[model samples]
Each structure stands twice: as structure tokens, then as C-alpha cells.
Target: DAAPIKKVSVVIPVYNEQESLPELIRRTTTACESLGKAWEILLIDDGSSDSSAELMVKASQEADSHIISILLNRNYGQHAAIMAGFSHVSGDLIITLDADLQNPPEEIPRLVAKADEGFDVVGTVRQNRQDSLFRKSASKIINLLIQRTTGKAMGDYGCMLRAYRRPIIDTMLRCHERSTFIPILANIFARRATEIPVHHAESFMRLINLMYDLVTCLTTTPLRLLSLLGSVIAIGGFSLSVLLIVLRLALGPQWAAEGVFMLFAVLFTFIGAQFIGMGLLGEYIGRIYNDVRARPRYFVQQVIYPE
Candidate 1:
């Protein structure tokens, strides 16, 4: 094999996909089998409530060799599980995909081929995605936010069928945030990136929380909104005070006297909005402080490397 990458490693973050395990292993093996170089698969079980672990272990045992199953302590979500998988890779080229078959294993060759063309990291763009309208719209909104915040634009951010070289993986593993959304997160470390058009499907169900963790860690978007909101509310507040004084001078004492009721109503609403804004700002600060304090640690319960 005269290619730049000889060994290929597939790091799959598994949750409760018991039904998908056998087929995943079979298709994944087929994807790499024709590569003509050593390849391995690492399935990190993220505290699955189903029999995914049982099936994974069985698959590993029957394999004679290769196919390592990592058991994480609890449900640490997909990103953490993938990071855990990254920590144990020995292959020259590492690829991350999901067990849910939404990202087809057949695309492995395409991603690697793209990487082979001098890209340190290769991401994928889903062509004709199969997903609900709401899900698709929500994904678009989040993608725009990430693109605007990080300035590292991506085509199909939710698609995880990606390939990386050794140096990029080492730089990625150096990041130790408790919460990570890898596609966008990986861009922080990758010096050169390329996107290949590919087939795709569904992804992580924890999309709601992923948004929260990403903005707070990757950008100060929340803090920016907080400031904009504060200015708008303060301007409204000053106008209200001026109105009360105007009523007292022009109308009479009774009109201004009764105006006290409306004053408190507007004042309380203003305070409430400001409080919520403050909390969002505080959440940003907390995320920064927490990540800064824990940048040296990568969460993992156990890792099973191929012998």
C-alpha cells in the first residue's frame, strides 16, 4: 500500500442500538476489507440500557481478532464516547461514524479517498437527507449558529462520516471539555479540512443540549445577545420614566397618581427580562470557568484496544 495512510481505524459511538450491532460490524468490515491494509473497529458503549454491549462483546469474541468494545461507565453522550474512542486509536487514519446506520459504512472508502488527497481531516455533506421537516429546520438553524460563531463553516455538520490523520487526532485529543460536538469541535484542531459529497441519515438525539454546550464553549453568542437585549430594555425603561413625569406635569395629580399602577407593571417585566438575561450570561461564565479548569482531563471509564 503506497497510500499515505496504511492502517484505518473506525471509532463508533454506540448507545442502545442492539438491533444494529451485527449489521454494523458486517457492513463496516465490508467497507474496510477492500482497502488492502490493516483496519480495526472500536465500538464505545455509552452506558447502553439495551443489550448493545452484549451483542458487541459477542461480535468481538467471534471475530478471532480485531473489533474491540469499550465500556464507558455511564451515558456520557455521543461526543464524549467518540473522544474516549479517540484516546485508544493506533491506526494511521482514524474515522468516526455512528452505529445507527444513518451514516452508511459504505461511505468509508469515499471519506478515506478524500483524505488521501492531502486533507488532514475530511468531513461529509449529506445528499438528499431523509429527516423530518422540523428536524431539518432545527439542524439548519444550529448549523448557521455554529458557522457564524466559529467561522469554520461546514456543509452537513450532523453527518459524522469523517476521516482524520494522526496529527489532527492528537491535537483533538488534547482538548478536554466535558461536552464536545466533534464535527465543529474537530475544526479547532485540524489545520487543513476538505468536505466530500456523500450519502447520509439521522444522528445524535441529544441535539438540544449539544447546542447549549457548543455556544457556551465555542463562542460568546449568548453574551452578545445578553448585551443587545439589555440595551433595548433599558431604553424602554427610560421612556417609561419620562412618560410618568409628563403625565404628572400636563394631565394633573390623579392621572399621574393612577399611573403608579402601570409603572410597577412595566418595571417588574423589565426586571424579569434582565434577570433571565443575567442568568444566560452567568451560564456562559460558568461554562468558561468549568472548561478552563478541566482542559487537561478526557473523560473515560474504560477503553478496550485491539491486541
Candidate 2:
């Protein structure tokens, strides 16, 4: 006997997806209604350049009346859009989706069912993805990198159709990170998690952006790598210096004068390593600076909910 699911909330972040809102809302609304429990869908318009914000409000005013349209002040990216939705959610269980409809809204019921099994987090793996070959290949490499850094083997970090119990959602909210990978953030607090195969899903630069966020937000392994590298280079430089000194003593004082170029080369290597360390340290400090500012992740222009 598991705890009864009081309500569920679906959060979808809309960008310049004006064309997909109508069908996305229709199919997603149908899926939520099929759950036979109280549910709401929060459509967060992430400052779309198109009329997606207007469409979001239109969907909320529809006869279904379970949709909530939140229009942000400007583009805050997908993760921040979801964070805005997370703040407004009132459901016991929360699920996230994308406006693209790549991961079918029809799959929402399955994710909710899995959440009912007492798992704090329910992750999904995309089976036979509908994305291009490059996107698929990039995803595989990024997935492995995430595993190595975070030490969690999430079946698919690229899938947005995942579910989280309310407790885990609250924990994530309390974190207050300026940049984050939602899946990794949730997994950090998840005591019990389960993954199920759902269905498919970016670009080369976008994949690089995702890696940047994962490295800066999710892990500090790169910083650690820099420290280790510095130590190894220091050892190598010390050994080279000893060898140069021995050669000068065994040969003649002129040996040192002839190898002045070698001294300059070693000096250059030391300077390069120092600059590299400083740059990585600067990134971490920049993150801290952003967080310390305490600015809102996003601003909501309006929230349209049924009265």
C-alpha cells in the first residue's frame, strides 16, 4: 500500500515554439486527464521571440482549465524556465516535459505510474531516438562524461520526461544554484530512483554548452584535474633543472651559457601552467559572483491560472 498521489504537475518550457503549443497542449492535456487524479500543467514561456507566450495563456484559458501559463520577462533558458515552474507547482508529484513533443506527452501517465512506486526520482531512457545521427552520437559521449563526473549512471540525461516526488523537488528549490543540470540536481537528493525506457530526442555547439553547464554546475573534477596537473608539471620541471645543473657541472661553465634557450623554454611552460590554473579558478569565482548577487533566476511577467 503506497501513499495516494494527491496531484501531479507537468512543467513544459516553451521557447520559439509557437506552432507546437496547440497540439502539445491538446495531447498533454489528454494525457493528464487520463491519469484519473488531480493534475495541472504549467506552461512556462521562456521569453520566446515568437507568440509562444500568447499561446501559453490561450491554452490556460481553454475549457480544460488545468493549464497554467507563466510568461517570463525574457529568455532564461530551458532549465531556468523549469525552475520558474518548480516554484509555482502545487502538486505532490512533479514531472517535466519539453515543448517539442519529441518525448511524447502520452508517456506522462507511464512516468506518473512509476513515481507511484515510491521512487523519489523517475528517470527515462530514450529508446530508438528520433534525433539525427550527430545528435545521437554527441548525446552518448555527453552521457558518459556526466557519469564519470557525477558518479551516477542516469540512463538518459537528455530526456526531459522525468518525474520527481514533491520532497525531491523542494530540495532542489532550496539549492539556489544559478546554473544547473536539473537531472543531476535531482539525482543528488534522490534516495530512491528508477529509470524506464520511454522514447526520443540537440546540436554540436548546444552539446558543448550542455557540457559547460555540467562541468561548471554539476562537478569540480576539472578544477581537481588542474591541481593534479600542476603537481606533475612541478615534478617534471624539478627533474629537468637537476639534469641541467649536473650537465653544467660535469661539462663546463660554458655548458650553462649554451643552454640558456632551454631555461627560457622551461620558464614559458611554468607561465602557461600558472595562467591555466588562474583561468579555471576565475570560472569558479565567476560562478560564486553570480550566486552572491542573489538575482532571480527569471522574472514572471504574469501567471494565468483558472479562477
lDDT of 2 by residue, 138-218 (tens): 777777876785555676676778899998888788876646678987776676777899756434687787668777765
**Lowest-sum lDDT 10-residue window in model 1:** 293-302
**Which pairs, if any, clash in model 1?**
none
TM-score of each: 0.77, 0.80
Give the per-residue lDDT digits (tens) of candidate 1, residues 1-307. Answer: 1248889999999999999988989999999997887999999999999999998888788836579899998998887898899999999899998789988899998888777777777988888887688778877887787678555677777778889888778877775654566777666565567788886655656776766776766665566667667766766765665565554446676655655655674575567567566766766786777667454333353679998
The local lDDT score (0 to 100) that residue 81 gets in candidate 2 is 93
- The clash count for each model shown is 0, 0
Candidate 1 total steric clashes: 0
